[PDB]
């Protein structure tokens, strides 16, 4: 595919591949602490003391494009969507925000958000469900996929929703395969669905094919010590020694903020990777490069507004900053100094998205992000 | 949550409270360098590899 | 190394423990509540 | 303005009618009478 | 009991109910809601139920589980997000549905009458 005349627009262009949903919250696991079954009224207590998992928690991929065009970049969006109502108003919102939809395929074989599945009892009286036929989202061939969003975008960014499904995953390898071919880079965002927090094992075989074609990997901190060792990593946070403390430090009983070495993340460590992201929340992170790695330090605050505080959509808002700076400043690769500087502008990012209700509600501009920035952090630092 | 005892008393008693030192109490100052060598030592007679030190006079059995 | 404040607890070859303290400036024709080895509570005066 | 919400109060009760066990109808008093 | 009217008509039921209930006859089409405390969009979801819950008055019957509560069984359903919700007929021919995110009330109620 090459037809064009003049060069390409100055914000490089970012590849968004994946199901377009509203207000979705794929990782979920068991809270310790619920707070009443019916009376939602008090429900908001979760977000001032959330459950470790839910601090920072990602979304749908529209939601990421959303967020990074917000931010001052350019985004383009690969899905399908059935000829609905739903299907027909989702497109409205995200073409509202200059988020392009020319990869955005109708099609009518199927309902937006829709999947039809059976009943199958099975042994005992425990039931199952079997998808007979997919959602719209997920129903994606590798035939219609538009061949020059593939080649003008420089950074592809998926999440591992896509390997739930058996067709998105070859339409997912295809468009990896055509971006690689034309040169982008690959973003692989770890926002994992419930029935891929089943086993370590069977998540590390599923995301193995997919995690050795990415360049870029972002992972919060569940989602790594759940990929390397939960006991472990368990165990080390919560320890406190019997006699005497080592340094001072540990003497004060803060909250444990652990940067890993480079020979406990070198399992998930390839020769094609150019960066990984560990994110503790906004609080905290941790960047490993081929030749450095380090810390970001930041912070977060949703007790400031304890009645309009709503955690769904930063971890998105943080991504969306990592690539923003990153399609802004390309020698943030081997300068660990503009590396760090650039970082908390993400951070700054997270910390705006948290203060509000709804995901796609309250994305920060750029220019509050900045506001926020040079605001939190010393002039030294920003 | 561990934690040492310690008694005030000192051979007085008037209200009787007591301590408990924990981790949180004290902490260690890292590495440093100093000298650590005093010593008056003597010569070994090595026997069944149980030592038998005699340093002036010769072995004394 | 910058010592912290504190009272030496160890003397160990190359370490030494500290076990903390703070210190309380104390001028001319002031008044100490309590003996020596006071046991002190989180709120109660010391100097006037 | 919706009430119920996440940020209003749980809905004031009818106070005779929240008075479920120490409160009886005119018919039970007068039967309990005789 | 009959002198106040319940401030909440959705009724929160364990993972055997929602078996025996599925399995057994039903004349009126199910709804099966998947939420969580912590969850931040489920609060919205929960109001949208609560009203819908009101103009269907007994033709159609609202249930809701907990995730919290019931993991496997949840995880079992094929469910891969919170906000999710699970469309019964009420005859065993048809095949139900599953439907994720805030979807908008009035898509519900094409659902639940135009598919069920």
């Given at each position: 595919?090459?037809?064009?005349?003049?060069?390409?627009?100055?914000?490089?262009?970012?590849?968004?591949?994946?199901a377009?949903?509203?207000?979705?919250?794929?990782?979920?696991?068991?809270?310790?602490h619920?707070?009443?079954?019916?009376?939602?009224?008090?429900?908001?207590?979760?977000?001032?003391?959330?459950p470790?998992?839910?601090?920072?928690?990602?979304?749908?991929?529209?939601?990421?494009?959303?967020?990074?065009?917000?931010?001052?970049?350019?985004?383009?969006?690969?899905?399908?969507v059935?000829?609905?109502?739903?299907?027909?108003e989702?497109?409205?919102?995200?073409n509202?925000?200059?988020?392009?939809?020319?990869?955005?395929?109708?099609?009518?074989?199927?309902?937006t958000?829709?999947?039809?599945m059976?009943?199958?009892?099975?042994?005992?009286?425990?039931?199952?469900?079997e998808?007979?036929?997919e959602?719209?989202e997920?129903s994606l061939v590798?035939?219609?996929?538009?061949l020059?969003?593939?080649?003008?975008?420089?950074?592809?960014?998926?999440?591992?929703?896509?390997?739930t499904?058996?067709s998105?995953?070859?339409?997912?390898?295809?468009?990896?395969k055509?971006?690689?071919?034309?040169?982008?880079?690959?973003?692989?965002?770890?926002?994992?669905?419930?029935?891929?927090?089943?086993?370590?094992?069977?998540?590390?075989?599923?995301?193995?094919?997919?995690?050795?074609?990415?360049?870029?990997?972002?992972?919060?901190?569940?989602?790594?010590?759940?990929?390397?060792?939960?006991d472990?990593?368990?165990?080390?946070?919560?320890?406190?020694?019997?006699?005497?403390?080592?340094?001072y430090?540990?003497?004060?009983?803060?909250?444990?903020?652990?940067?890993?070495?480079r020979?406990?993340?070198?399992?998930?460590?390839?020769?094609?990777?150019?960066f990984?992201?560990?994110?503790?929340?906004?609080?905290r992170?941790?960047?490993?490069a081929?030749?450095?790695?380090?810390?970001?330090?930041?912070?977060?605050?949703?007790?400031?507004?304890?009645?309009?505080?709503?955690?769904?959509?930063?971890?998105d808002?943080?991504?969306?900053?990592?690539m923003?700076?990153?399609?802004?400043?390309?020698?943030?690769?081997?300068?660990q100094?503009?590396?760090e500087?650039?970082?908390?502008?993400?951070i700054?990012?997270?910390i705006?998205?948290?203060?509000?209700?709804?995901?796609?509600?309250?994305?920060?501009?750029?220019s509050?992000?900045?506001?926020?920035k040079?605001?939190?952090?010393?002039?030294?630092?920003? | 949550?561990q934690?040492?005892?310690?008694?005030?008393?000192?051979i007085?008693?008037?209200?009787?409270?007591?301590?408990?030192?924990?981790?949180?109490?004290?902490?260690?100052?890292?590495?440093?360098?100093?000298?650590?060598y005093?010593?008056?030592?003597?010569?070994?007679?090595?026997?069944?590899?149980?030592?038998?030190?005699?340093?002036?006079?010769?072995?004394?059995? | 190394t910058?010592?912290?404040?504190?009272?030496?607890?160890?003397?160990?070859?190359?370490?030494?423990?500290?076990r903390?303290?703070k210190?309380?400036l104390?001028?001319?024709?002031?008044?100490?509540?309590?003996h020596?080895?006071?046991?002190?509570?989180?709120?109660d005066?010391?100097?006037? | 303005?919706?009430?119920?919400?996440?940020?209003?109060?749980?809905?004031?009760?009818?106070?005779?009618?929240?008075?479920?066990?120490?409160?009886?109808?005119?018919?039970?008093?007068?039967?309990?009478?005789? | 009991?009959?002198?106040?009217?319940?401030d909440?008509?959705?009724?929160?039921?364990?993972?055997?109910?929602?078996?025996?209930?599925?399995?057994?006859?039903?004349?009126?089409?199910?709804?099966?809601?998947?939420?969580?405390?912590?969850?931040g969009?489920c609060?919205?979801?929960?109001?949208?139920?609560?009203?819908?819950?009101?103009?269907?008055?007994?033709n159609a019957?609202?249930?809701?589980?907990?995730?919290?509560?019931?993991?496997?069984?949840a995880?079992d359903?094929?469910?891969?997000?919170?906000?999710?919700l699970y469309?019964?007929?009420?005859?065993?021919?048809?095949?139900?549905?599953?439907?994720?995110?805030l979807i908008?009330?009035?898509?519900?109620?094409?659902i639940?009458?135009?598919?069920?």
């Amino acid at each position: 595919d090459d037809g064009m005349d003049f060069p390409y627009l100055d914000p490089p262009l970012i590849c968004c591949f994946g199901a377009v949903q509203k207000e979705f919250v794929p990782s979920v696991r068991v809270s310790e602490h619920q707070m009443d079954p019916d009376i939602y009224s008090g429900w908001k207590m979760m977000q001032w003391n959330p459950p470790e998992f839910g601090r920072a928690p990602g979304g749908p991929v529209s939601n990421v494009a959303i967020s990074h065009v917000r931010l001052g970049g350019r985004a383009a969006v690969i899905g399908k969507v059935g000829e609905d109502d739903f299907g027909e108003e989702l497109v409205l919102m995200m073409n509202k925000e200059n988020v392009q939809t020319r990869a955005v395929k109708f099609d009518s074989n199927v309902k937006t958000a829709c999947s039809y599945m059976r009943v199958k009892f099975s042994d005992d009286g425990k039931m199952k469900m079997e998808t007979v036929k997919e959602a719209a989202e997920d129903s994606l061939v590798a035939s219609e996929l538009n061949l020059a969003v593939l080649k003008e975008a420089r950074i592809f960014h998926f999440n591992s929703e896509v390997l739930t499904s058996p067709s998105m995953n070859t339409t997912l390898f295809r468009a990896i395969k055509l971006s690689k071919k034309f040169g982008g880079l690959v973003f692989f965002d770890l926002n994992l669905p419930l029935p891929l927090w089943k086993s370590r094992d069977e998540t590390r075989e599923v995301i193995k094919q997919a995690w050795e074609e990415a360049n870029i990997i972002e992972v919060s901190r569940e989602e790594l010590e759940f990929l390397l060792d939960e006991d472990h990593y368990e165990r080390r946070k919560n320890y406190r020694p019997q006699y005497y403390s080592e340094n001072y430090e540990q003497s004060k009983n803060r909250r444990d903020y652990y940067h890993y070495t480079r020979e406990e993340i070198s399992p998930l460590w390839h020769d094609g990777l150019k960066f990984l992201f560990v994110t503790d929340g906004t609080l905290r992170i941790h960047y490993y490069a081929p030749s450095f790695d380090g810390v970001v330090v930041g912070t977060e605050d949703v007790l400031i507004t304890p009645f309009t505080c709503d955690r769904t959509g930063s971890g998105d808002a943080v991504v969306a900053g990592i690539m923003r700076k990153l399609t802004s400043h390309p020698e943030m690769y081997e300068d660990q100094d503009v590396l760090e500087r650039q970082l908390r502008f993400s951070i700054a990012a997270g910390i705006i998205s948290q203060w509000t209700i709804g995901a796609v509600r309250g994305f920060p501009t750029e220019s509050a992000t900045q506001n926020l920035k040079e605001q939190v952090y010393v002039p030294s630092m920003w | 949550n561990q934690g040492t005892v310690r008694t005030l008393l000192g051979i007085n008693k008037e209200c009787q409270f007591f301590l408990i030192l924990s981790s949180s109490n004290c902490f260690r100052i890292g590495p440093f360098k100093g000298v650590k060598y005093p010593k008056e030592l003597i010569k070994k007679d090595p026997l069944i590899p149980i030592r038998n030190s005699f340093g002036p006079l010769g072995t004394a059995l | 190394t910058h010592l912290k404040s504190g009272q030496v607890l160890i003397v160990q070859f190359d370490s030494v423990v500290i076990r903390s303290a703070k210190p309380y400036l104390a001028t001319p024709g002031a008044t100490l509540h309590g003996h020596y080895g006071e046991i002190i509570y989180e709120g109660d005066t010391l100097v006037t | 303005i919706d009430y119920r919400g996440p940020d209003f109060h749980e809905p004031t009760p009818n106070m005779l009618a929240h008075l479920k066990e120490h409160g009886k109808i005119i018919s039970r008093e007068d039967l309990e009478k005789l | 009991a009959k002198h106040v009217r319940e401030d909440y008509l959705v009724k929160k039921l364990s993972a055997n109910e929602i078996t025996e209930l599925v399995r057994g006859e039903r004349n009126v089409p199910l709804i099966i809601d998947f939420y969580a405390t912590w969850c931040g969009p489920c609060i919205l979801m929960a109001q949208e139920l609560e009203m819908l819950a009101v103009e269907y008055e007994k033709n159609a019957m609202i249930v809701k589980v907990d995730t919290d509560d019931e993991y496997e069984f949840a995880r079992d359903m094929q469910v891969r997000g919170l906000p999710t919700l699970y469309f019964i007929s009420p005859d065993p021919n048809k095949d139900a549905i599953r439907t994720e995110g805030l979807i908008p009330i009035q898509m519900m109620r094409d659902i639940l009458d135009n598919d069920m």
